[PDB]
Amino acid sequence: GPKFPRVKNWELGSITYDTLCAQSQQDGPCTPRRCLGSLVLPRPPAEQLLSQARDFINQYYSSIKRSGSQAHEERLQEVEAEVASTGTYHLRESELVFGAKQAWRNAPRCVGRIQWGKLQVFDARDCSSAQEMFTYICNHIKYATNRGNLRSAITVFPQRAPGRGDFRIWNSQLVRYAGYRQQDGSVRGDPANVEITELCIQHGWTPGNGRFDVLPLLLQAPDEAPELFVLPPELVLEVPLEHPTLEWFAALGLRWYALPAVSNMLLEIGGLEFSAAPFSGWYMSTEIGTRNLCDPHRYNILEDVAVCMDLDTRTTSSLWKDKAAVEINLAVLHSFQLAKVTIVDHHAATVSFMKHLDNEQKARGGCPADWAWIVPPISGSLTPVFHQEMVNYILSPAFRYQPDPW
């Protein structure tokens, strides 16, 4: 065959070669000596910026089928002259739209990519206060939430400037429950959010005392202290959780919010960096039902639920963890459906990712995918992705992790 990775699906016996990886311009964490594929995180001046800009502009003109043309070479020229005199440059409106989608398309760890082409891109590159950031975010939440008929969106605030503070959103997600450190070492609420909760209270937030207290937003305009904003409750749609047949489940008082809106990622496009570009899609049920509710280091509710189920938790072989997790996941789906709020179960999501893989094979000759992340945390081999070999690599545009602002 060719000298590109051969890629096998073991369920179906089919083979593809990934030619897209040749486009990768950035090294990941692996070497021939050892694979670091399972680590969650592993570790601008003119020369560097310009070639990255050049690459992206090429990408753009390729996508509108005008590669090599006059409008393409002039834009190239327009870019290098702007870098020549200010040291940075700016994207045209449709370039941002293209690059933002491309970043979602390029994201190895997102199972939701069948939807990449359908993203609402809000340009907020005129935003100039923390207050204004709030407004923008509120509009984003209203739009995307669409009373339950969730719609994918991204709001792009202004880019990193040479010696100028960043636009940052301190919260890792637009909606997050509080995590209060107790005197008995324990945590009331979401243990994932202890630090940000503590940051909020330090910046003047009067705290609650519940397992599902919605956090305020800490929003930071350049060179300024972060300002604190409460989201009006009518804007934050939540779903109380109940089970289709286990009647007692409604009595646990569990709930989740509708809009999964990540806010601490860096969005890189042709070398430009947008430190505040929160984006939102809709949940896969396992995120809430398996990770958020059952992780030993989150809500940790598995024992509570299995007791109500009257299962034998004294021993592992009764599969009590497995039984409860299934019921909790099904409660997530049932309650989301009932409330008429968009959700996708881990089966549908994975099937649709297989179709996305097939599209991308036809379109780009491959698709970067992080197997450990794409395969769900329950019912793994029950879904088709488990049986699909994946190649992982960094394409740009991209979303990156970035340091916390404090």
Ligand X SMILES: Cc1cc(N)nc(CCc2cccc(CCc3cc(C)nc(N)c3)c2)c1
Ligand Y SMILES: C[C@H](O)[C@H](O)[C@H]1CNc2nc(N)[nH]c(=O)c2N1
**For residues 146 and 313, which CB has a smaller minimum distance to its own copies in the complex?**
313
For residue 41, state whether it binds ligand Y (rule: CB under 6 A). no
Q: What is the three-class DSSP state of 147?
A: helix
DSSP code for 139: H
256 an active-site residue?
no
Element (H, E) at 57: helix 46-63
Which stretches of 116-263 are assigned E, i.e. beta strand? 120-123, 153-156, 168-169, 179-181, 187-189, 217-220, 227-229, 238-240, 255-257, 261-262
8 A C-beta contact, residue 208 and residue 223: no
- 273 in contact with ligand HEM (CB under 6 A): no
Q: Which of 57, 97, 107, 228 binds ligand HEM (CB under 6 A)?
A: 107
Q: How far is the CB of 381 from its own copies (least distance, A)?
A: 3
Determine if residue 35 is labeled as part of a ligand binding site: yes
Cα Rg of the chain (Å, integer): 23
Three-state DSSP state, 165:
coil
SS3 152: coil
Burial, 185: exposed, middle or buried (Cβ in 10 Å; 0-12, 13-18, 19+)?
Answer: exposed
Site string for ligand X, 134-173 (x = CB under 6 A): --------------------------------------xx
164 is catalytic: no
- Which of 205, 212, 229, 386 contacts ligand Y by CB under 6 A? 386
Residue 94 assigned as binding residue: no
**Binding partner at 139 among ligand X, Zn ion, ligand HEM, none, C-beta below 5 to 8 Å by kind:** none
Q: Which is nearer to ligand X, 40 or 251 (CB)?
A: 40
> Catalytic residue among 105, 113, 168, 211, which?
113
Phi, psi of 371 (to 5 degrees): -55, -50
Gap between the Cα atoms of 255 and 237, Å rounded: 11
Q: Residue 201, exposed/middle/buried by CB under 10 A (0-12, 13-18, 19+)?
A: middle
Is there a catalytic annotation at residue 367?
A: no
Q: Which residues pair with 154 in a beta bridge?
A: 121, 279
Residues that bind its own copies (CB under 8 A): 5-8, 10-12, 18, 21, 24, 27-40, 42-43, 290-291, 294-297, 302, 316-319, 321-323, 325-326, 329-330, 333, 337, 345, 347-348, 351, 368, 370-372, 375-382, 384, 386-387, 389-393
| Residue 21 binding target from its own copies, ligand Y, ligand X, none, CB below 5 to 8 Å by type | its own copies
Shortest approach of ligand HEM to residue 283 CB, angstroms? 6
Phi and psi torsions of 272, nearest 5°: -70, 140
Kindly tell me which residue out of 199, 265, 302, 395 binds ligand X, with binding defined by CB under 6 A.
Answer: 265
Dihedrals phi, psi of 58, to nearest 5 degrees:
-50, -50
Phi-psi region of 163 (alpha: psi -120 to 50; beta: other; left: phi over 0): left
Q: Minimum distance from CB of 109 to ligand X (Å)?
A: 8
Exposure string (b/e) for 289-299, b if CB count within 10 Å is 16 or more?
bbbbbbeeebb
The verdict on whether 282 is a catalytic residue reads yes
Residue among 150 and 375 whose Cβ is closer to its own copies: 375
- Cβ-based burial of 212 (10 A; exposed 0-12, middle 13-18, buried ≥19): middle
Please tell me the distance from the alpha carbon of residue 189 to that of residue 208, in angstroms, as a whole number.
Answer: 10
Per CB under 6 A, does 108 bind ligand X?
no
Which tokens hold the place of 216? 């305020």
Of 116, 279, 299, 353, the one binding ligand X by CB under 6 A: 279
Q: Which of 264, 383, 392, 396 binds ligand X (CB under 6 A)?
A: 264
The answer to whether the annotation marks 30 as part of a ligand binding site is: yes
Question: What does 373 interact with, of its own copies, Zn ion, ligand Y, none (CB < 5 to 8 A by kind)?
Answer: ligand Y
Judged by the rule CB under 6 A, the positions of this chain that interact with ligand X are 40, 172-173, 260, 262, 264-265, 279-284, 287, 401-402
Which residues are known to be catalytic? 110, 113, 282, 287
Annotated binding site: 30, 35, 38, 110, 173, 282-283, 287, 292, 372-373, 386, 401
Judged by the rule CB under 6 A, the positions of this chain that interact with ligand HEM are 104, 107, 109-112, 115, 119, 152, 154, 279, 281-282, 284, 287, 344, 349, 373, 399
